[PDB]
RNA sequence: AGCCAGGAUGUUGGCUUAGAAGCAGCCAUCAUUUAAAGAAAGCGUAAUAGCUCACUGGUCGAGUCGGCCUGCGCGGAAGAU
């Protein structure tokens, strides 16, 4: 949409109301009331069981305005939400633990298909196979 | 070259006096003349000025490459002018214009009031901002840089006299 | 009378930073060097001052012609300041009844009992320009002890009945105890102020908050320096309630069968703690008792004395005070101090582990050459739960050293376990295993294996890099602006184990875990980071280490 | 201006121009990276 | 080589998550769009907001660029009636 003024996509798990210090600056860019971004998203945050980093983007406007785009959580954390542990990448090509087939990957891609125009089904399938091999995970169908 | 692909277009309102090597430009508010070197072949051809490097001085592509940039600035300097603003950041430091003289509240035991030459119409909107106006690009810097050299930008506070567009690099104490 | 001294800037800077409502009165005439007039705006009169004299003239004139319009636009904001002070001046700002000098102050004096506006005045103290002007506002804008709510003694514990007592001489006596200085003449002194009532000379003045009996001696007034004996203390004087046996911060000075106060609010915490050490051993006899008359003066001066090392560990809120109380000891208390470091638990641990160190013993002490070439193996510092700091795992090869000579080798190791090859830092809590104990008959005794074990233990430390088991304090720091990023980076120079950055309405409170061994000049360093703008807490939580690597070369 | 026999182009934005014949190297923000001999 | 010029945007890139959130460092080192973009070079820095390299995506509208070999030149080069 917009241009060289501001465009950063950063939001982490929305159970924490206070802007986490490293996220702070993406809210510390164009003069927000930080209570506004706390009161914008919580009307829909009560339709979730919190625990995963959900992303939003920030985008700005002239006087004191701003805007933001809501999407669904990415499949990268959805790989390690089902797998139990949040960080598995210790050795990529030397660990063979943990299987999920393609059927789980497409049903977490329909929620991408019902939300976004990129991150398409069949193209991300090798990169949701590619985030498996870097973590040291296996896949069979 | 790039300079050979750069001719300058004199407009109406600035008259040239081509006595060969000595050109005295009769302009809007002054007389911006430069007595160039003999490594140039000058001709106000139709309206757009064309130049040339003389033989023997084949390094005159440099010596007239100065000149192509030179006279372009002269015809636009005698008419429009240069705004050369300076930013006075000093504890108790003021600036005020009277006639052609500038005060210098410069933290000394005695005042410094230096008279400024022709080609200068100076102004001061406040104690920290000071206009300089002029016709030559050299004289609009030379009288400006002398003030700045009396109190250089101090890189521990940001103290000093500094230009409008100049951005200092102030450091931190880090010991005590 | 200085450059950059804009009067109208600073009073209109309070409305931006302090957020208050100042409406100033005495304005400025002069370009700060030829400055001659201070513009009082109620009476609209400028005041002439001394040519250079220390105080001749007070010559009042009109408003000068060089400021005839700035007096116009600023007087109309003065006479605003009573229409919104009292509701009754609202209809004569607009109706146009005259706003005289005497009428407006009757509203504004009642605007000092709620304190929404402060009254500002420009001038010079040192150039004698304004000091004679500044006194007339004090009797008309600063409140009197009989115009204020007076002494309000509540009760004790029965019921909350706050009772406004009288400001005149017709009440039971009442005072308070503060600024309780000392002297080598009578001992304790006070700078106390009586609010109402009259006392005679000689009284059984108690301190009714701490249940003690005192008698009222010879009271003395000062010119802030010189002894002038004030016999009869009237209601409102400030004097020296002398001869109090025990007295604390802010308790009552009151006759019995009278109202009684019990109030001590905001007891401070002196934060920076430095440990004073004597010069001679005759000094500690007089520096052990230094706490007596010194800490009795003020609660911004504490001594956190240890339980073991018996050194005197002081505590101040500023080192700038911990300057002065050493200089208070210097020429009058006649003390030579050696100010050093506080008692941090310095329990030498071990980074490296020595393989085998043999104590070389060979001496014909008892007739035949009493030998004793015993060898010990440096075992890792015993961790977890180990109440005994001495964990000698005597591993005699086949029970070769007899029970009689077991104390021998034990003593040697124990002696160097309590000692330290750096600055006598106990290598305690360090489990030590005996490798092999050489045993003899006529060459076996106590020294035989004691002396050997002593050297053996020390030898090992030289090739074992003993570090420093250290206590870790929970250190919080409160800093308002975005200048804490330089702090927490400089805190990262000192192993401040970070917890999180949190905010308040005005402050950004940082949470960290800092080694107590890394305290040193923490106070003076943040005071050059925070510029002194910091107000925070100090607690304790974990226990970690601090780099030493001294065995390499520093340790002989 | 520090002097040494070696002018090595050290800072990432280091200008080199031959003023008077002796080389002195021009950085932008680092005064420490400016040598003059060689 | 400069002025406009997006720095297309999956991601938090883990670990150990206290921040080691492309910018501390070890193993991977795929890329949803490939007419412009790497799981990355420094500065801003606890982290990032700010500013770029990346392709110059659109303008100028011609030459230009980094090294190898030699002819010579400069610096290196300061001494004592």
UniProtKB/Swiss-Prot annotation, chain A:
Forms part of the ribosomal stalk which helps the ribosome interact with GTP-bound translation factors. Part of the ribosomal stalk of the 50S ribosomal subunit. Interacts with L10 and the large rRNA to form the base of the stalk. L10 forms an elongated spine to which 2 L12 dimers bind in a sequential fashion forming a pentameric L10(L12)2(L12)2 complex. One of its GO terms (molecular function) is rRNA binding. The gene is rplK. Pfam families: Ribosomal_L11, Ribosomal_L11_N. It comes from Escherichia coli (strain K12). Keywords: Methylation, Ribonucleoprotein, Ribosomal protein, RNA-binding, rRNA-binding. This is Large ribosomal subunit protein uL11. The modification N6,N6,N6-trimethyllysine is found at residues 3, 39. PROSITE patterns: RIBOSOMAL_L11. The lineage of its organism: Bacteria, Pseudomonadati, Pseudomonadota, Gammaproteobacteria, Enterobacterales. The modification N6-succinyllysine is found at residues 71, 80. The keyword Ribonucleoprotein applies.
UniProtKB/Swiss-Prot annotation, chain B:
Keywords: Acetylation, Antibiotic resistance, Ribonucleoprotein, Ribosomal protein, RNA-binding, rRNA-binding. The modification N6-acetyllysine is found at residue 43. SUPFAM superfamilies: Ribosomal protein L6. Pfam families: Ribosomal_L6 (PF00347). One of its GO terms (cellular component) is cytoplasm. InterPro entries: Ribosomal_uL6-like, Ribosomal_uL6-like_a/b-dom_sf, Ribosomal_uL6_a/b-dom, Ribosomal_uL6_bac-type, Ribosomal_uL6_CS. GO terms for molecular function: large ribosomal subunit rRNA binding; structural constituent of ribosome. Coiled coil: none annotated. GO terms for biological process: cytoplasmic translation; response to antibiotic; ribosomal large subunit assembly. Gene3D superfamilies: Ribosomal protein L6, alpha-beta domain. The keyword Cytoplasm does not apply. Belongs to the universal ribosomal protein uL6 family. HAMAP family: Ribosomal_uL6_B (MF_01365_B). Part of the 50S ribosomal subunit. This protein binds directly to at least 2 domains of the 23S ribosomal RNA, thus is important in its secondary structure. It is located near the subunit interface in the base of the L7/L12 stalk, and near the tRNA binding site of the peptidyltransferase center. This is Large ribosomal subunit protein uL6. The lineage of its organism: Bacteria, Pseudomonadati, Pseudomonadota, Gammaproteobacteria, Enterobacterales.
UniProtKB/Swiss-Prot annotation, chain C:
It is found in: Cytoplasm. Keywords: Acetylation, Cytoplasm, Elongation factor, GTP-binding, Hydrolase, Nucleotide-binding, Protein biosynthesis. GO terms for cellular component: cytoplasm; cytosol. Its EC number is 3.6.5.-. One of its GO terms (biological process) is translational elongation. The modification N6-acetyllysine is found at residues 360, 499. GO terms for molecular function: GTP binding; GTPase activity; guanosine tetraphosphate binding; translation elongation factor activity. Belongs to the TRAFAC class translation factor GTPase superfamily. Classic translation factor GTPase family. EF-G/EF-2 subfamily. Catalyzes the GTP-dependent ribosomal translocation step during translation elongation. During this step, the ribosome changes from the pre-translocational (PRE) to the post-translocational (POST) state as the newly formed A-site-bound peptidyl-tRNA and P-site-bound deacylated tRNA move to the P and E sites, respectively. Catalyzes the coordinated movement of the two tRNA molecules, the mRNA and conformational changes in the ribosome. This is Elongation factor G. It comes from Escherichia coli (strain K12). The chain holds residues 145 to 700 of 704 of the full protein.
UniProtKB/Swiss-Prot annotation, chain D:
It comes from Escherichia coli (strain K12). One of the last ribosomal proteins to be assembled in the 50S subunit, it contacts a number of helices in the 23S rRNA, acting as molecular glue. The simultaneous presence of uL16 and bL36 probably triggers ObgE's GTPase activity and eventual dissociation from the mature 50S ribosomal subunit. GO terms for molecular function: rRNA binding; structural constituent of ribosome. Coiled coil: none annotated. Belongs to the bacterial ribosomal protein bL36 family. Part of the 50S ribosomal subunit. It holds the Pfam family Ribosomal_L36. PANTHER family: 50S RIBOSOMAL PROTEIN L36, CHLOROPLASTIC, LARGE RIBOSOMAL SUBUNIT PROTEIN BL36C. This is Large ribosomal subunit protein bL36A. Disulfide bonds: none annotated. The lineage of its organism: Bacteria, Pseudomonadati, Pseudomonadota, Gammaproteobacteria, Enterobacterales. One of its GO terms (cellular component) is cytoplasm. Keywords: Ribonucleoprotein, Ribosomal protein, RNA-binding, rRNA-binding. GO terms for biological process: cytoplasmic translation; translation. It comes from the Bacteria. HAMAP family: Ribosomal_bL36.
């Amino acid at each position: 949409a917009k241009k060289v003024q501001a465009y950063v996509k950063l939001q982490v798990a929305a159970g924490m109301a206070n802007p986490s210090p490293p996220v702070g600056p993406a809210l510390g860019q164009q003069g927000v009331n930080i209570m506004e971004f706390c009161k914008a998203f919580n009307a829909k945050t009560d339709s979730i069981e919190k625990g995963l980093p959900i992303p939003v983007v920030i985008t700005v406007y002239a006087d004191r305005s701003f805007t933001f785009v809501t999407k669904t959580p990415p499949a990268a954390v959805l790989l390690k939400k089902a797998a139990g542990i949040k960080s598995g990448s210790g050795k990529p090509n030397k660990d063979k633990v943990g299987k999920i087939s393609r059927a789980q990957l497409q049903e977490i891609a329909q929620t991408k298909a019902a939300d976004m125009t990129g991150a398409d089904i069949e193209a991300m399938t090798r990169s949701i196979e590619g985030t498996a091999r870097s973590m040291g995970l296996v896949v069979e169908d | 070259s790039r300079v050979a692909k750069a001719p300058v277009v004199v407009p109406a309102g600035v008259d040239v006096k081509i006595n060969g090597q000595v050109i005295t430009i009769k302009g809007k508010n002054g007389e911006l003349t430069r007595t160039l070197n003999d490594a140039v072949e000058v001709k106000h051809a139709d309206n757009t000025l064309t130049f040339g490097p003389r033989d023997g001085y084949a390094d005159g592509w440099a010596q007239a490459g100065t000149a192509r940039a030179l006279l372009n600035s002269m015809v636009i300097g005698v008419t429009e002018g240069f705004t050369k603003k300076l930013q006075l950041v000093g504890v108790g430091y003021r600036a005020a214009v009277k006639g052609n003289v500038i005060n210098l509240s410069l933290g000394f035991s005695h005042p410094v009031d230096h008279q400024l030459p022709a080609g200068i119409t100076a102004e001061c909107p406040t104690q920290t901002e000071i206009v300089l106006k002029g016709a030559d690009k050299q004289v609009i810097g030379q009288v400006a840089a002398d003030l700045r050299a009396y109190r250089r930008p101090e890189p521990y506070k940001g103290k000093g006299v500094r230009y409008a567009d100049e951005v200092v690099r102030t450091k931190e104490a880090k010991k005590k | 009378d200085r450059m950059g001294a804009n009067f109208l800037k600073v009073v209109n800077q309070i409305k931006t930073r302090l957020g208050a409502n100042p409406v100033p009165l005495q304005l400025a005439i002069g370009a700060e060097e030829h400055f001659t007039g201070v513009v009082d705006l109620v009476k609209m009169k400028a005041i002439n001052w001394n040519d250079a004299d220390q105080g001749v003239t007070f010559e009042y004139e009109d408003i000068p012609a060089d400021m005839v319009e700035l007096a116009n636009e600023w007087h109309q904001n003065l006479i605003e300041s009573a229409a919104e002070a009292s509701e009754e001046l609202m209809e004569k700002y607009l109706g146009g009844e005259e706003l005289t000098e005497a009428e407006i102050k009757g509203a504004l004096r009642q605007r000092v009992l709620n304190n929404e506006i402060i009254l500002v005045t420009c001038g010079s103290a040192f150039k004698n320009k304004g000091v004679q002007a500044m006194l007339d506002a004090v009797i008309d804008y600063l409140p009197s002890p009989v115009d204020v709510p007076a002494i309000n003694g509540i009760l004790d514990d029965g019921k909350d009945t706050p009772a406004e007592r009288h400001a005149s001489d017709d009440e039971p006596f009442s005072a308070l105890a503060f600024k309780i200085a000392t002297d080598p003449f009578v001992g304790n002194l006070t700078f106390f102020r009586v609010y109402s009532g009259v006392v005679n000379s000689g009284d059984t003045v108690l301190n009714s908050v701490k249940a003690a009996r005192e008698r009222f001696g010879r009271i003395v007034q000062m010119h802030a320096n010189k002894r002038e004996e004030i016999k009869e203390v009237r209601a409102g004087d400030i004097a020296a309630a002398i001869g109090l046996k025990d007295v604390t911060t802010g308790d009552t000075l009151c006759d019995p069968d009278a109202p009684i106060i019990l109030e001590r609010m905001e007891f401070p915490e002196p934060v920076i703690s430095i440990a004073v050490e004597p010069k001679t051993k005759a000094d500690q006899e007089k520096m052990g008792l230094a706490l007596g008359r010194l800490a009795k003066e003020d609660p911004s001066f504490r001594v956190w004395t240890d339980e073991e090392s018996n050194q005197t560990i002081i505590a101040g809120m500023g080192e700038l005070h911990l300057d002065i109380i050493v200089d208070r000891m210097k020429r009058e208390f006649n003390v030579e101090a050696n100010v050093g470091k506080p008692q941090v638990a310095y329990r030498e641990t071990i980074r490296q582990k020595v393989t085998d160190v043999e104590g070389k013993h060979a001496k014909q002490s008892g007739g035949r050459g009493q030998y004793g070439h015993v060898v010990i193996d440096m075992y890792p510092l015993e961790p977890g739960s180990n109440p005994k700091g001495y964990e000698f795992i005597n591993d005699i090869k086949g029970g070769v050293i007899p029970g009689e000579y077991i104390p021998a080798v034990d003593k040697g190791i124990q002696e160097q376990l309590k000692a330290g090859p750096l600055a006598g830092y106990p290598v305690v809590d360090m489990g030590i295993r005996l490798h092999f104990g050489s045993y003899h008959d006529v060459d076996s005794s106590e020294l035989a294996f004691k002396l050997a074990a002593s050297i053996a233990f020390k030898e090992g430390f030289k090739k074992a890099k003993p570090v420093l088991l250290e206590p870790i304090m929970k250190v919080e720091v409160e800093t308002p602006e975005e200048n804490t990023g330089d702090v927490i980076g400089d805190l990262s120079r000192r192993r401040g184990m970070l917890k999180g950055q949190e905010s308040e309405v005005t402050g950004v409170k940082i949470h960290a875990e800092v080694p107590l061994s890394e305290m040193f000049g923490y106070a003076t360093q943040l005071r050059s980071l925070t510029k002194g703008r910091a107000s925070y807490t100090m607690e304790f939580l974990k226990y970690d280490e601090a780099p030493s690597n001294v065995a390499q070369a520093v340790i002989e | 201006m520090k002097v040494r026999a070696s002018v090595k182009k050290l800072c990432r934005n280091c200008k080199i121009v031959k003023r008077d014949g002796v080389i002195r190297v021009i950085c932008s923000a680092e005064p420490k990276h400016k040598q003059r001999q060689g």
